[PDB]
Amino acid sequence: IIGGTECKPHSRPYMAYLEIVTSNGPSKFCGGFLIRRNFVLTAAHCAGRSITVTLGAHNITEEEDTWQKLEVIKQFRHPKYNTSTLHHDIMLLKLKEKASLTLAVGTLPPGRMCRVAGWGRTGVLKPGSDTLQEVKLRLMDPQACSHFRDFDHNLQLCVGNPRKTKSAFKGDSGGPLLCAGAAQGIVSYGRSDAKPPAVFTRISHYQPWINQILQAN
Ligand SMILES: *[C@@H]1O[C@H](CO)[C@@H](O)[C@H](O)[C@H]1NC(C)=O
Ligand SMILES: O=C1Cc2ccc(Cl)cc2N1
Ligand SMILES: [Zn+2]
């Protein structure tokens, strides 16, 4: 998160910290959010050979009793996810067992301001953050994201005032974008120089597919 503040620890009990395993390189990291005791929503491009989920975390380098490190049994990436257009950047993770409900861990059931949180990098050349950072971003008209050639208003949200530095960035993918407390978007992609706006998956469009996956599993 660029241009944000450190969250009050555990003020966002649904936040999930993802460690992703591939076969040809070291681990990668994304965010995500617990929508069912055993289901975590994140970005399609965070998929890997295997994934571990830590719930209840603030400072991700210091273990604490709030922590729930959970195994992912199955990854449900959207079937139509496109590595060329980046369309349908969305994935459901099924946890091996249902998470415990605690104070620190629980499910989450243009021109306006939304908020987005993550453990991602705090600047173009900065490392990922140790602690959960958040930032408030402006929801933009779709023409503000026209320069992303495959951006699609129906599928995506355009997020972030270009006059401001604030933004999600690497490591923040899969995190929820909340407007008035409700999840509206998912961190997906943007420019490598982090100049806003950036592109978020529009959750509402994928709601049928989401419900589909839940009931079948
Ligand atoms: C997080 O924890 C580590 C030690 O576990 C510490 O070195 C680091 O400065 C901490 N960061 C914050 C801001 O709490
Ligand atoms: O909002 C975001 C998320 C993200 C990931 C990676 C890059 Cl290069 C840019 C952005 N912008
Ligand atoms: Zn704590």
The CA distances from residue 3 to 52, 72, 97, 122, 187, in Å, are 28, 32, 36, 7, 16
Centroid of chain to Cα 165: 19
| CA torsion, ordered 129, 101, 63, 181, to nearest 10 deg | 20
- Decide: 64 in ligand 1 pocket, CB within 6 A: no
162 shares its domain with 117: yes
Q: What is the resolution of this structure in A?
A: 2.3
| Experimental determination approach used | X-ray
49 shares its domain with 64: yes
Whether 173 is catalytic is yes
What's the token pair of residue 188?
A: 């997906």
4 shares its domain with 65: no
Dist CA 137 CA 142 (whole Å)? 15
Q: Where are the beta strands (DSSP E) in the chain?
A: 5-6, 15-21, 28-36, 39-42, 50-55, 68-77, 91-95, 113-118, 133-140, 156-159, 176-179, 182-189, 198-202
Compute, in angstroms, the gap from residue 66 CA to the centroid of ligand 3.
6
- Name the domain count of the chain: 2
Residue 44 contacts residue 88 (beta carbons within 8 Å): yes
153 shares its domain with 130: yes
121 DSSP assignment: B
Which ligand neighbours the alpha carbon of 200 most closely? 2
Cβ contacts of 199 within 8 Å, gap of 6 or more: 86, 145, 148, 151, 156, 157, 158, 159, 188, 189, 190
- CATH assignment at residue 59: 2.40.10.10
Residue 126 contacts residue 109 (beta carbons within 8 Å): no
Q: Which residue of the set 129, 167, 173, 188 is catalytic?
A: 173
Structural domain boundaries enclosing 97: 13-107+205-217
- Decide: 62 in ligand 1 pocket, CB within 6 A: yes
214 shares its domain with 168: no
Centroid of chain to Cα 66: 20
